[PDB]
């Protein structure tokens, strides 16, 4: 099949506006010495650590 007619501006924009992305949320690193933003349930790219203020196990050597 082929598009019979050129789609109107209103309809094209109605469909196109739904092509979007949500913002990444980010969470503050539990390490007091780092305090950076990292993905939830993900090792902090700055400190390379994971876990609550206590645990704090190293995950990434960075």
């Amino acid at each position: 099949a082929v598009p019979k007619r050129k789609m109107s501006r209103s309809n094209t924009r109605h469909r196109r506006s739904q092509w979007k992305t949500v913002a990444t949320k980010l969470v503050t690193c539990a390490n007091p010495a780092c305090g950076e933003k990292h993905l939830p349930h993900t090792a902090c790219p700055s400190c390379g650590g994971y876990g609550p203020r206590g645990d704090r196990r190293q995950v990434v050597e960075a």
Partner: protein
């Protein structure tokens, strides 16, 4: 252990078997490995089965582990270092932690690592 339900890694179940076995071998070789989320979570059960089998050291057990792995050096590592490291552990010999994503293809990445500290 349990099969993978959905489509297999590497475009073929035989290749998935090869991938999981090699990935477990590399995990045992290096202690830790960054291997994306799905591969790590799929290799965890097999790796823990192998570690549990290696927790008790007999010639028959070493041959059974060598059925998998197939690198006797890695078998020696598993039966000498990893095995005795888990004398008191009742399972859970490995852990997986997410790292981020790959820039090239947005693969969610994670590191799977054998437990290092002694339970006692």
């Amino acid at each position: 252990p349990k099969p993978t339900k959905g489509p297999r890694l590497g475009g073929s179940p035989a290749h998935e078997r090869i991938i999981l076995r090699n990935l477990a071998s590399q995990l045992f070789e290096h202690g830790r490995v960054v291997t994306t989320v799905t591969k790590a979570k799929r290799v965890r059960p097999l790796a823990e089965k192998l570690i549990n089998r290696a927790k008790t050291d007999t010639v028959a057990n070493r041959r059974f582990v060598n059925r998998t792995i197939t690198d006797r050096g890695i078998v020696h590592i598993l039966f000498t270092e990893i095995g005795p490291r888990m004398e008191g552990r009742d399972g859970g010999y490995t852990r997986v932690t997410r790292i981020g994503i790959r820039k090239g293809d947005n693969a969610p990445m994670a590191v799977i690592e054998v437990i290092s500290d002694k339970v006692a």
